[PDB]
Amino acid sequence: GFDYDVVVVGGGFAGATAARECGLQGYRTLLLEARSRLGGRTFTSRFAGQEIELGGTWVHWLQPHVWAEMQRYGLGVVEDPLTNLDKTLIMYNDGIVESISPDEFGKNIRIAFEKLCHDAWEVFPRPHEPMFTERARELDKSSVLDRIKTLGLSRLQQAQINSYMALYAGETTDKFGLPGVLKLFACGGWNYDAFMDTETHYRIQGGTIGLINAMLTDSGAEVRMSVPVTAVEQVNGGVKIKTDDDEIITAGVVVMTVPLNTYKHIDFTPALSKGKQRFIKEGQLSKGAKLYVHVKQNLGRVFAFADEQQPLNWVQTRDYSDELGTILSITIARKETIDVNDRDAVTREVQKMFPGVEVLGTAAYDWTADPFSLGAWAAYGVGQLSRLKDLQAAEGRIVFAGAETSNGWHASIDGAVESGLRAGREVKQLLS
Amino acid sequence: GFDYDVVVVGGGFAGATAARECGLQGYRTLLLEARSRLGGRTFTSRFAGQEIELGGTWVHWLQPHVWAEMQRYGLGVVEDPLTNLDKTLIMYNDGIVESISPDEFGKNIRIAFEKLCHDAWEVFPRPHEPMFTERARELDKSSVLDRIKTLGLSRLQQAQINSYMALYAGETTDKFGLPGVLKLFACGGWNYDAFMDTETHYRIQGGTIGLINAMLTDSGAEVRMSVPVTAVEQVNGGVKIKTDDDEIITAGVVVMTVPLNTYKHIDFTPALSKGKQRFIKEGQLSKGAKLYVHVKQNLGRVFAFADEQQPLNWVQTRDYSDELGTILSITIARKETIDVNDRDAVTREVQKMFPGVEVLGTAAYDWTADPFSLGAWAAYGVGQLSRLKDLQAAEGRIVFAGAETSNGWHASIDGAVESGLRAGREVKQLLS
Ligand SMILES: Cc1cc2c(cc1C)N(C[C@H](O)[C@H](O)[C@H](O)COP(=O)(O)OP(=O)(O)OC[C@H]1O[C@@H](n3cnc4c(N)ncnc43)[C@H](O)[C@@H]1O)c1[nH]c(=O)[nH]c(=O)c1N2
Ligand SMILES: Cc1cc2c(cc1C)N(C[C@H](O)[C@H](O)[C@H](O)COP(=O)(O)OP(=O)(O)OC[C@H]1O[C@@H](n3cnc4c(N)ncnc43)[C@H](O)[C@@H]1O)c1[nH]c(=O)[nH]c(=O)c1N2
Ligand SMILES: CN1CCC[C@H]1c1cccnc1
Ligand SMILES: CN1CCC[C@H]1c1cccnc1
């Protein structure tokens, strides 16, 4: 006799997926979202006359959960200009920007990545069972920098791969866990060309928010925004959920999908297991941010890495023409290197990378400062992947999901969807 | 005012998927299946104390649609013994059986396959859009043998790759379309090690029939077996469906999922488009069959190719031990090379490959003789992939699906599931 069969906390991809799974079974379903918008660590917006994605953006058909959703809802891919590049740049830690022949640039990051992931087949034959091999557990004592130091890379190759890895860490690479990277590489078919294609090439037709809305419309669930959950109590065979204004909603089961780094906002009664408490105290690593810049010049199709002591770590073209100029998509590994909301600073750093351009505008999102993400994409520190099952475990009538808790594409939209399908299955089990 | 909102014809993976999609929307749904069982070109059975799969068997997490279903229903993988092989054999067209070091055997098929598919990245950058490039249309004038003749392969390599390709054709390789193979290779991450892992390594926990049953239970649809549809007439804004005993069922929309090679059993009014009629007159190529053999000896973990003039084209171990002996899974490219239901012949051919073994039993399935498949897995002849859209097109209130009609993994369970998700979306569009 509860208010709802299931309450889903969080309206990103994990929560939207879980609510869709539950609603299609006929369960009375409520989704509670803290922000005044949906999408979570994805956010569709507009800038310089284009639709832009200020969080998670790119997907691929090798990513099984999100691709199946795109198949169900009839969403095509939209290709960003990553082939036939006009310029490929590396900006080293010492501030030098060097233009590299695009063919040579791609050959060298491929060599570095395949060397970094040389044992991916042996360590992760089953990337959706991350601790399947003893070697993966042994490697979880090492960081990505530990391995980079043994590869004998050239100066170009070392700068490229350390830029790539600092971005995926949202942190310096001495803190970044090694097995999680090998596992993503295995997910992308154990080969660099395939894996790179999955990461920044194709966007969703209609945007991330379009797929969120399709799922929630399908679900039939009641959806409420601007309602943060601040406490969850298991009592009377179900759960009592309290919001910041002390209203109480009861439910048979709760699906938690909030980002790991935000669990400090929520009091659990009884306390969560010690393993989960350890993960909550640690958090995940990433301190990233994202921004678009509109410049007056037509730079064509460009790509740049910047190493971890520099701010503009991953740059590529979103749009270009003589009439428009260029819109650049820029992802930042560590928000401490640049205040993406400080336009003067942004203009200085962009000109450092592209001397002589005039900045006509910017659009930025500081995911690390946002109270309802407190960080960016999921990134495991040393030793954390080994303990993933602690985060995944159900605790009585509370089910846990979110990209951090997925087995496969944990840094991606796909991993969020995966965790939501798992959550739907677990809700069905708990309501049987 | 029809009997049903939607009638799904056929209870293989495409039909089970479509019925699930439609039932979860609340549409009044009926599935009609011709055989007295479900599963279509998959069939879970029992032999020598083990559960066996006499049709489609192996899946992979790089296959997005079937993997997402396994995530939803909580189905793990079951690994067959393909690593650390004890014996790898090649049987040439001239009947010689040669034992090859397993490491060398794998190196040589990898070289042959990567050479055959050397241009897969350029021809199929988007494997789910098969005619995206002009080069793919140009290559659809050539057969797989046409390309093999230009590779300069060794005797071992040519025999290995021609065996592999005759199996995927279910026919001799001079008739097999080239682009469809390049496209499957692209689906498997554009690399041989990944692609091979997707094809014969992992089975579905609980079997193909377990996943069919889960989908149809979820669907809530009414399911009727031993009811072949023999005619479909579009009339009165919907469809009239006639069965072999002249009963008539009416519906708003019909989803056709029967195998292409069986369309001769069904009269359409009005006639289907000329493009579809051409495909129906041509059919798809494969003439394959499958069988398991129980021998008294423990052969360990074995793998064999046999070239296309010989019958046992793809052999691997299903189970082995000293107490049990060995169960071998054998797939046959062309049913004209061996009568899989003739036990004496099977014993002769197995002994030709494994001289000295004692055959204790067999279990076989002649998919090419079965009236409700009239062939095996989908295999395109020369020029057919270019015309795929003709087969996919809706015709008024009739939607078409089945693995032959998919864009990606068309030779697989995954492509069937893909086509069923597409059909569900199209039914939703037609009922709006
Ligand atoms: C800048 C940037 C860039 C990328 C990416 C992320 C970021 C930040 N990613 C990763 C991808 O965006 C990410 O993995 C998923 O969006 C995570 O979805 P979840 O639903 O797990 O969490 P997510 O954080 O999206 O959703 C959780 C929800 O919980 C809410 N919430 C928090 N506390 C709450 C409370 N107390 N009460 C109620 N609700 C609460 C939040 O407001 C949020 O809506 C990505 N991926 C990819 O596939 N391709 C890409 O290109 C990128 N790039
Ligand atoms: C021997 C063998 C081996 C393999 C495979 C196939 C075969 C035959 N495949 C391919 C895979 O099995 C195949 O692609 C799908 O099962 C096809 O699913 P569909 O639903 O498209 O057709 P499918 O043929 O399964 O379903 C069509 C249904 O329509 C019914 N029907 C026909 N005419 C009718 C009528 N007039 N009225 C009513 N119903 C009618 C049939 O009885 C059948 O149940 C495979 N794939 C893979 O992923 N891994 C693998 O290892 C293999 N290996
Ligand atoms: C594809 N991604 C997953 C998480 C980070 C992200 C990414 C990669 C390159 C540039 N920006 C974001
Ligand atoms: C994995 N497959 C798809 C269709 C044919 C099939 C196959 C491959 C190897 C041996 N038997 C069947």
Residue numbers in the entry:
A (entry chain B), B (entry chain A): 51 to 482
Task: Show sentences the authors wrote.
Nicotine oxidoreductase (NicA2) is a flavin-dependent enzyme that catalyzes the degradation of nicotine into the non-psychoactive metabolite N-methylmyosmine (NMM). NicA2 acts by degrading nicotine in the bloodstream before it reaches the brain. Clinical use of NicA2 is limited by its poor catalytic activity in the absence of its natural electron acceptor CycN. The higher in vivo activity of NicA2 is due to the presence of a cytochrome c, termed CycN, that acts as an alternative electron acceptor to O29.
We were unable to solve structures of NicA2 v320 but were fortunate to obtain well-diffracting crystals of NicA2 v321 in both the ligand-free and NMM-bound forms. By contrast, the NMM-bound structures of v321 and wild-type NicA2 are very similar with an overall root mean squared deviation of <0.5 Å and no obvious difference that would explain our observed change in activity with O2. Our stopped-flow experiments demonstrated that NicA2 v321 has an increased rate of oxidation compared to the wild-type enzyme, but only when it is bound by the reaction product NMM. The observed increase in the oxidation rate of NMM-bound NicA2 v321 raises an intriguing possibility that the mutations in this variant alter the transport pathway of O2. After addition of NMM to NicA2 v321, we observed a substantial downfield chemical shift in the major peak of the enzyme, possibly due to conformational rearrangement in the tunnel region. We confirmed that these conformational changes are relevant to catalysis by observing a similar spectrum after the addition of nicotine to the enzyme to achieve the NMM-bound, reduced enzyme state that was rapidly oxidized by O2 in our kinetic experiments. Therefore, observations made using the NMM-bound oxidized enzyme report on the conformation of the enzyme relevant for the oxidation step. After NMM binding, NicA2 v321 undergoes major rearrangements in the tunnel region, as indicated by the collapse and substantial downfield shift of fluorine resonances in our 19F experiments. We further demonstrate that this new conformational state is overall more solvent accessible in NicA2 v321 than in wild-type NicA2. This may indicate that the mutations encoded in NicA2 v321 allow greater diffusion of O2 to flavin in this catalytically competent state.
